[PDB]
From a paper:
In order to reveal the atomic-level details of co-translational folding, we determined the structures of a series of nascent model peptide with increasing amino acid length. For this study, we chose the human [name] Trp-Trp domain (WW domain), which consists of 35 residues, as our model peptide. The topology of the WW domain composed of three strands and two beta-hairpins, which form an antiparallel beta-sheet. The structures of the intermediate-length (WW11-[name], WW17-[name], WW19-[name]) and full-length (WW35-[name]) WW domains, which are fused with [name] at their C-termini, were determined with X-ray crystallography.
In this study, we prepared WWX, where the X-residue N-terminal WW domain fragments is denoted using the format WWX. WW11, WW17, and WW19 take an alpha-helical conformation. The structures of WW17 and WW19 form helices in the same manner as WW11, in which the region of the residues 12–15 forms helical structure. The most prominent difference between WW17 and WW19 is the torsion angles between residues Ser16 and Arg17, however, they share essentially the same helical structure. However, in WW17, this hydrogen bond is not formed. On the other hand, the residues 17–20 at the C-termini of WW17 and WW19, where hairpin loop 1 is formed in WW35, take more extended conformations, while the conformations are stabilized by a kind of the short-range interactions.
Numbering used by the authors: 1 to 387
The structure:
Amino acid sequence: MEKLPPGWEKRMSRSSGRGSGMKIEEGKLVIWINGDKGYNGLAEVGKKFEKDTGIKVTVEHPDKLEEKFPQVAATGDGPDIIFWAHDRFGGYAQSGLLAEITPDKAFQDKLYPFTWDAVRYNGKLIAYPIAVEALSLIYNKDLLPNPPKTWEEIPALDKELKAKGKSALMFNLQEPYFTWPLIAADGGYAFKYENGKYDIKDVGVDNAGAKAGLTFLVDLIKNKHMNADTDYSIAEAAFNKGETAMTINGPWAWSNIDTSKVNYGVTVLPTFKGQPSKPFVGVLSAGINAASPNKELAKEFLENYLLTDEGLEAVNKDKPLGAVALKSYEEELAKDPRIAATMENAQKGEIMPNIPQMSAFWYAVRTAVINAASGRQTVDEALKDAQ
Ligand SMILES: OC[C@H]1O[C@H](O[C@H]2[C@H](O)[C@@H](O)[C@@H](O)O[C@@H]2CO)[C@H](O)[C@@H](O)[C@@H]1O
């Protein structure tokens, strides 16, 4: 084995009552999914399940559910099913919070092999794969018929649009997920992937490539092309109201842009130092709470209602999922240019590790970016800390 991620002391404080029966309600399904996803669409699938079974399906979307789940599940409470990108699930699994899932070989053949890989932890399947998420460059086609192919061009493009009372680019600077594609472009990485194994001793958050990418970000801010305060909501409002020509976001965001006046394109992220931006790619996945008394219901719901063409379509019509893991539905989606873009950024990026250390990693990088962007620390100082 390998050294446990930080916080064993705290996980042990949650020990009492863990398995000593604390109740999730038997005879229904409670599901957690992030509020940016198609949770209404998911609830519709839930209604279909209820019609066929008499089993009520309740979908909730609490803020910070990826942090709340291990807190509530460790005591044996929480949702029956938790949706999040696969990167959090190895930590959950190592804490004992997830049931191993048991799809037969027939079912497994309906999803792409690499998506099962993403939800396999220490040789065992610990969640159902749903969709493949990659960030793309989203741009206003009226403001910008030809989107920039490089990060390097964006300051000049900004000067251009500033003269027209617009700006070039706004995206969420508070979550490192969104700046990671730039940090990784010139060689930053999380953990060294050697011989099919992640080396937790070899972290690349402060190598030359990481520093170059983060420095480019902070220079954008220094030069008033971006603002360190910009978050998800600010950037989205600004793009969807036509004040900024570009944003960086995932497929879930398209629905809101659709309802806007903006005629937009979805495309490949620009290069940095001549190399592709490398988004960390997530597989939206559904795990079954180890403490759930409804595991067979959860299985049935996920395999026979959600992971179907009609199930994923209900969710997708609410908020687009991206490239889905279900082969039959993905062949249909693959024709959308926006999904093509999603797929290109996905293959240029890297499927996130699911190892238990990912939570600590993201927290470290989150702090590093925020501190460097605000000017509280220098790029070198901030990244040195993260290592
Ligand atoms: O920023 C750190 C954060 O990145 C990823 O979270 C994504 C998630 O994958 C997407 O589904 C979407 O909801 O946006 C999130 C970023 O705000 C990781 O999956 C997550 O563990 C990590 O903390």
